[PDB]
Amino acid sequence: SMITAITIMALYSIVCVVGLFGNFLVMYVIVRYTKMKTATNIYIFNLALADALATSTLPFQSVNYLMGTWPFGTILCKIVISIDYYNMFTSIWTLCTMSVDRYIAVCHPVKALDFRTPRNAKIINVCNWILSSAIGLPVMFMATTKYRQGSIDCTLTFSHPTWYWENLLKICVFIFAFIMPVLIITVCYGLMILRLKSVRMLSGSKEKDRNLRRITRMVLVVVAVFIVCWTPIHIYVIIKALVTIPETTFQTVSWHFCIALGYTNSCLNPVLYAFLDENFKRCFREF
């Protein structure tokens, strides 16, 4: 009992601290030195902001798990749930937009010259945030606090019939946040690698092949981290919805571990996108 709660609380605390430290560090480095003069840096800044806001709602979930009830109130319940659902889509679609940007940058150079500009990246990012607002607003409205067995619960209430709207929301969140992003990222990066193999400057030498292998490993690491992190929580939620499973301690540990891994991807995106980036590495070398 105590060992389980200590493990879950420590896991959430470590994931929250690492995510907040990484997100604020990346944002501070971008704002203080880079000054957002390039489209890619704009995308990285938006990704860091979305991951920071998504990670910010994790201590509220930790307090909810520890106390077994919601003491914050209805308004803050609406704000926290809305920010969580909003920023999850914001992060994932920002990842998709960066994948499409790299695809256009590699495969279609002449089109990338028009496409890759500060203005266009600002317009596409504003469109991404508005698309996130689409899912964010009903989540903000529906969410309330319900009195159950002497405990306040912070949750979504669905209009009658509850089952139809609840499972429709689960299916839509599953499809838009998992099925389309995995396919877009996988196909775009696969065609990107196939185009890079054709490039004469990448092949034809030892060190150049080593650099091509480095780029390929970086791409495979990003895609593998995305799939391996987001896949268990979505599949687990679909299984839980479809098939009722008896309550066990192992179920609780698996559920919170899947949630922690889902947030852990948002925590680990600043490292991969910013610290492993060569431009930021040069900025670190200079300073």
């Binding site: 390039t38 890619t40 790299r102 940058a105 590699v106 150079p109 002449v110 990338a112 010259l113 890759r116 490039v199 004469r200 400057m201 650099n211 780029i215 970086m218 980036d277 060569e278 431009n279 930021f280």
Partner: peptide, 19 residues
């Protein structure tokens, strides 16, 4: 045109920072 295309690909990847 092909060489210019390769130079633009190199510049775009350097701007992204993969190199």
């Amino acid at each position: 045109f092909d060489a210019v295309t390769d130079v633009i690909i190199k510049n775009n990847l350097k701007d992204c920072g993969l190199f």
